[PDB]
Amino acid sequence: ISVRGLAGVENVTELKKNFNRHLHFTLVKDRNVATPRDYYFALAHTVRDHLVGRWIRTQQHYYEKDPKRIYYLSLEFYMGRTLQNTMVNLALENACDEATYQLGLDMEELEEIEEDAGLGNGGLGRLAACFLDSMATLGLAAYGYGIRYEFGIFNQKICGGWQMEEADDWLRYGNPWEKARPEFTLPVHFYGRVEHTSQGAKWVDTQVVLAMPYDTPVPGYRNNVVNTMRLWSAKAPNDFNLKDFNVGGYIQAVLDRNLAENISRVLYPNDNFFEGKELRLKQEYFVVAATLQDIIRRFKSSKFGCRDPVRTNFDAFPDKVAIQLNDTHPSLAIPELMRVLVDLERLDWDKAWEVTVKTCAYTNHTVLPEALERWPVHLLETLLPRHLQIIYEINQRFLNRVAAAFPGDVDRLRRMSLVEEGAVKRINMAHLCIAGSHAVNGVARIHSEILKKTIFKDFYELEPHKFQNKTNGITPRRWLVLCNPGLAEIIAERIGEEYISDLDQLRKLLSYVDDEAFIRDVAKVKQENKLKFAAYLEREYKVHINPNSLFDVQVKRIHEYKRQLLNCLHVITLYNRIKKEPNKFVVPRTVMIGGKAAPGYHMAKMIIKLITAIGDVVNHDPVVGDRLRVIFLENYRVSLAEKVIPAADLSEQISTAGTEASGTGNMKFMLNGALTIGTMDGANVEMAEEAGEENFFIFGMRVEDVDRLDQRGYNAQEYYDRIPELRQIIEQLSSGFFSPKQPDLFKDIVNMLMHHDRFKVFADYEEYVKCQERVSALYKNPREWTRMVIRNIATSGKFSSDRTIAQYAREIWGVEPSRQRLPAPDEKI
Amino acid sequence: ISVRGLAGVENVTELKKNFNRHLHFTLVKDRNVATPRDYYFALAHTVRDHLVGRWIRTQQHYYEKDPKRIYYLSLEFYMGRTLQNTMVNLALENACDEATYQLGLDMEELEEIEEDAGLGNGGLGRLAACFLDSMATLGLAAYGYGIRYEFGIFNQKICGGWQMEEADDWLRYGNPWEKARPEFTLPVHFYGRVEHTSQGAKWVDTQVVLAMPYDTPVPGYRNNVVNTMRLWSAKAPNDFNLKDFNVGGYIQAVLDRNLAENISRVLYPNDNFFEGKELRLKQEYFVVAATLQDIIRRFKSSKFGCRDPVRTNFDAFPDKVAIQLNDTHPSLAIPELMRVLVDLERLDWDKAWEVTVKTCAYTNHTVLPEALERWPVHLLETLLPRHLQIIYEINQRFLNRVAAAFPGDVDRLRRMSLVEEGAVKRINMAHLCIAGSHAVNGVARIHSEILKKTIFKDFYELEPHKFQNKTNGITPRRWLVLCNPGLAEIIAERIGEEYISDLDQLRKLLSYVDDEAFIRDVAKVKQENKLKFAAYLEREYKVHINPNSLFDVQVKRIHEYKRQLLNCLHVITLYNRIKKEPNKFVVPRTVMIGGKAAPGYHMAKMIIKLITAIGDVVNHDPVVGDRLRVIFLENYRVSLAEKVIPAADLSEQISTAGTEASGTGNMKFMLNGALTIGTMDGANVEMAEEAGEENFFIFGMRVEDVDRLDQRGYNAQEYYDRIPELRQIIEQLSSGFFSPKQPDLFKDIVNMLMHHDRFKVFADYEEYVKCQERVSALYKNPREWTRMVIRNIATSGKFSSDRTIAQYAREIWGVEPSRQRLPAPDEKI
Ligand SMILES: CC[n+]1c(C)c(C(=O)OC(C)C)c(-c2ccccc2Cl)c(C(=O)O)c1C(=O)O
Ligand SMILES: CC[n+]1c(C)c(C(=O)OC(C)C)c(-c2ccccc2Cl)c(C(=O)O)c1C(=O)O
Ligand SMILES: *Cc1c(COP(=O)(O)O)cnc(C)c1O
Ligand SMILES: *Cc1c(COP(=O)(O)O)cnc(C)c1O
């Protein structure tokens, strides 16, 4: 593969030299007693050395030049592994592959030893990761800020068909990529009270937790740019902690240091669901306070403390600082920036607010109400007394604006208020973000329009100019060149390598739909990947699948709105039809469903159980043979995504129209040569637009159809009474067919489907099964299946995070992207 | 246009010479006083002379060679005009075009003077016409037999928006193509009684009507074959009529001769509907008796009366005779052939039956029950006493077979009996045909399967080997080269002319989907035809349409099962949407609906009235402008079909799944460059299969969906309650919106739709409108619309009647087709 770079004789000897150096000096080992993990670490370190030169010069470059800086504040950074990604972006893969081979080592075996930096739940967490890669690739002075969780998203094990959670101890043997910067440690204050003195307010009597920053290098694609991901780690105060004059014992007081450090211990596993847990609120404030202090320091250090003429001011703050809020998670950045500016820097309220709004921008990722953050005011009053006061003042003045804008419209005031009334008063974080931001974007065209028409309609009416769209993207480096070198190889053979960082160029492939060689290659590459995945599944899990079958795959967090249940209905349909007519030929299929369920999300765990329950019957029916196989892939994480996606034929994106804001996995599948069967939801719409609906497999209700159904009332019983194939399945579930020793096992799934389905699974069942029929018809003809695949890959260009980021930069941040190769080669001399 | 043949200098002078000869000697006129009609007649005669040589040698050829003969018995022969068709098949078009131009005449103006030989109602009548053209083209010894109606299908005029019927007096100024053969006149017997004497039965005391045969030449495509269409004309008996010893007056008795001759006076205008009128039964027997006598005579004349050794026998009758029944119209041919063979030729019943079944074959054209012939036995007993006795004996023995085949199955006997019991005993003609035929075919794959699964299931179980499929075809000569020379021109420029009589060759055009010249030409040709049709409509009817708009056309006999009403709903939908959002761009459309309604079919005439009522509002709304136009084309006949079809963009084929047996107009549209929007019914299914569903516009319920609906019960109110756009239309109709001065005018249409719709118009409304939306999206892009047109034309090859006929020949008739050019050039020397 030529996209993997050069394996020069000198660079290779140098790599082996440095590999051996690290094994000896850094691992204190020798060939005779080193373990595979020692080898992976020796290689990782050797690779990291190549980043330091660029890493330092990049930061110096921004310091010298003083460009506006972009701050991506997120509570998640689903980075996955770093080794291969670092090699790819620096062009060291073939050289390192050669060097490790000369050393009698298999580089791919070593890559598998590395633990995923799984600090995310799903979509927005991984969006942050792709975004970092793109901002670096685009030469933007961008900095990622988050929490250095000790434990990321739990590792999922399946035991007896059920999901089992295990602590994701990814820091166990260390992390060779991060570098702590003790000198940048900062104090984060909690609790206390507020005392309004002579001139202003003061937040006093607080408990302190220190935030120690750990830097991780973010390398752009072969442009000598290395940006930084700064994650905060919580530490007990060296000072006051034990000096609290406590009489509970010296030992207990020391052990008690655990309490404060628990703030950065584990990522909350809630995908699209808000749980008002205080530890969570602490984590959110933790990242905001530290991050903002760091930003302000960096802002002050451009000799802006040296503003003698006119006097030191923060007027230029918005021209030098951009803070992007990934969801409302870091929303406290609004009141925090105001607290700092008014309480500590003594700016007048009005000027401080103008600066705050000009600095921040919020991004929404869902419309589901249970996903939005509404913190009880008592929780905010106890833990962040000063912040709640500022939120109230922000609200008062915002509602004064609304009032003057819409005189007499009382209910609008009630609806738009940051303060939610009721048994438990709460603060709507989304409203706080809209009020304190200059831009509010959605993550897909359809999503951005719904925001303006529904949940943020009132805000859209008050400030139309504020709302935007920034359709999600995925990075072509991790998501193509990294995970699918075979496909990137053949593409490169025809159109060169320019596309890796200019994905629209993939369109040139439309000139090959009838090219006989290309149709063969694209098919061989997919068959190779499918062959590869089958091997991984047999060795890592002793599974075994039919490589000569259609790989139907649905991988994403388990949710009701994602409708893995619909897919279940379809799989049982395929089973019943085969049982009905055994001698009737059907296109062989390997249905793969994967994803983690949030602990405590009962329905989600019941669904994972059904998927394996179905497999237990289907997978062992002799009549069925290898014509159908239902397999649940455990521990779906970024690393598995990079393996299964490149092997997929059909990409399941069947969420109820209007629920999935955009999705990004759908984009990953398109980029890798899989055809999509999905609703007109999220980015699926733009994906179909780009490739052409004739090249897609759209089905089911459209948003207006869902709304019409809601208007008259959804009645699952109707669908059950009118569809005999559906009725047969439901009766199979309810009678114990898929749970012999526990007949009533899935009675909750049945009950929900029949009486409490907010996602109308039944209403889309018929059109979905027929659509799948079409999928198999096409698969029956390899040449046309492939040619259509070509038309999708050829049009996935717009879904590259480079494009997304370029729009944020120009339309929200106010900075111009670049692709100019930074000089920084490495400081060897 | 090169497909029009050579215009040699000599052939042209010869034509002008002969043209002038006829004008003088045959029309007894001179240039100074001839009328346009004189000119058309002079040309027609000149052209007919060219057929005589081949005409005589062909008949001599069959006489000498003695091949098995194929007899196509039909009560209809929708021939349309003959002039251009004769020129095309003889290659005289350009020569005649040149010659008439030299004579200062416009040949196309002369062609318009010719009257349609409109002896058919629709589908099966025109199928017979295409079939004749193909059998000649295939060098088969085939003979067409029917009635020479004085008045064909009434000419439709629209007066005040309503249909008005006028006698179609097509023989008014004579018919230059036919040639009467008095010497072949034969007696047809009616009424009387039966007397069972010593040896056998005798049909005595009958009233006689004579059948005088008129021959019309059927020229094959440039292969020097000219077959014959022999139509019978009814004449009063020269003898007994006035010699009936009547005392009602000499004058009255002479005037009374009209009564018997009324048998061939007018074609019954019932498309797919059975009316038990005795005059109709007489017409049916009339054709059968005469035709069979002629066949038997011809059979006897191969020196088969000279069968000295062994004795004269009819054993070889099936090896020399094939009688194809176009529907059950000529079904009496079964008992007639038996009557002749047993009563007159004295064959034993058993041998006579074996011969009859081996000779005949029946073709079904519909499953609608109201269309099937069930003649009361009293009508059959009074008018054809001997035939009813034979039908009873046929039935007795057939039911004896069924009984021995399915012992104990009494209800099967009742179901399969030729005799239908009830208040009025009747005879099921379809059952008679199945029982007395060796082959029973359907006219489309889906149609032929339904026959075996539903109405003729019992018969299919008794004799599976008997049932077949013969998917309809259309002739590429009349239906392409004749009506669309521009399209045939461009096609010929790329692939030659071989396709005109080998349509599968059109596939070669798939090699031009990306050919820039071809995409331009196909589009220019369609634009030319649309330009041409617009001119015909402005001069012949002073209509005026927008040539720069999508030509949406639905032309076929007006019926409820054809759902011109659905199209109506859609047209009003397009109107209401425009009214709703005036400034919203819509693809301009010219909706054209045409077809005749059977007199007395109330609903059909109400529908024609609504189509013009809608036009009266739509066509005069200024807001609407030239964005939409609803136009009803009056007097839809073969001649209009040849003009409007080549100008069509979209072909409406929206019948309820399972009702339209095959259709052939759908095929005409495909062949001429129009895309099809239609249900999965009839031939639409095979058409979509051939071109590819991605190249088609299929929508609505499938046969099983209709059946599921029937199973639970169709309730139009549901659709009305759930679809607000539908509800708005229905209320427009019911409130008098489309009938101001007569608010309750369409209350019958509304009532039927809401409560008595056997064709579920509402159930297909939503999917139909959305499908149309797709149609317009494609039309918005000329290049892709055309490229898809190319993919349809390229795949219409299987719908050529040459293919259909070749299957009848080989699979039913037992004869091998040919394309060998007959020698017959013309007897000039
Ligand atoms: C004084 C300007 N900066 C610069 C040239 C840096 C550098 O050389 O970093 C290299 C070791 C990777 C860098 C920096 C500064 C001090 C301690 C640790 C780091 Cl990491 C930063 C930062 O805030 O992280 C800079 C900034 O801007 O304030
Ligand atoms: C004796 C054999 N046939 C033959 C060569 C024909 C002929 O020369 O026809 C030409 C004038 C067009 C033709 C025929 C015979 C007698 C009167 C009129 C015709 Cl039209 C037919 C027929 O039945 O019509 C023949 C037949 O077979 O019996
Ligand atoms: C890309 C990604 C997601 C998001 O997938 P969707 O199907 O868009 O919800 C979730 N998890 C992982 C590990 C991912 O790589
Ligand atoms: C071909 C033809 C028909 C049959 O059309 P369908 O739409 O198949 O019912 C009817 N009338 C005329 C004049 C025809 O040319």
Curated annotation (Swiss-Prot), chains A, B:
Residues bearing PTM N6-(pyridoxal phosphate)lysine: 668
> Which catalysed reactions does the entry list for this protein?
[(1->4)-alpha-D-glucosyl](n) + phosphate = [(1->4)-alpha-D-glucosyl](n-1) + alpha-D-glucose 1-phosphate
Top-rank taxon: Eukaryota
Entry EC no(s): 2.4.1.1
Q: Name one Pfam family in it.
A: Phosphorylase
Which keywords annotate this record? Answer: Acetylation, Allosteric enzyme, Carbohydrate metabolism, Glycogen metabolism, Glycosyltransferase, Nucleotide-binding, Phosphoprotein, Pyridoxal phosphate, Transferase
The UniProt activity regulation field reads: Allosterically regulated through the non-covalent binding of metabolites, being activated by AMP and inhibited by ATP, ADP, and glucose-6-phosphate. The activity is also controlled by post-translational modifications including phosphorylation.
Q: Which cofactor does it need?
A: pyridoxal 5'-phosphate
Sites marked Can be labeled by an AMP analog:
143
| Broad enzyme group | transferase
- Which residue positions does Phosphoserine occur at? 2, 417, 501, 734-735
Q: Which InterPro entries match?
A: Glycg_phsphrylas (IPR011833), Glyco_trans_35 (IPR000811), Pyridoxal_P_attach_site (IPR035090)
Q: How this protein is processed and modified after translation, per its record?
A: Phosphorylation of Ser-2 converts phosphorylase B (unphosphorylated) to phosphorylase A.
Residue numbers carrying Phosphotyrosine:
191, 214, 460
What function is annotated for this protein? Answer: Allosteric enzyme that catalyzes the rate-limiting step in glycogen catabolism, the phosphorolytic cleavage of glycogen to produce glucose-1-phosphate, and plays a central role in maintaining cellular and organismal glucose homeostasis.
Question: Which family, according to UniProt?
Answer: Belongs to the glycogen phosphorylase family.
Q: What's the subunit arrangement here?
A: Homodimer. Homotetramer; to form the enzymatically active phosphorylase A.
> What's the protein here called?
Glycogen phosphorylase, muscle form
Organism of origin is: Oryctolagus cuniculus
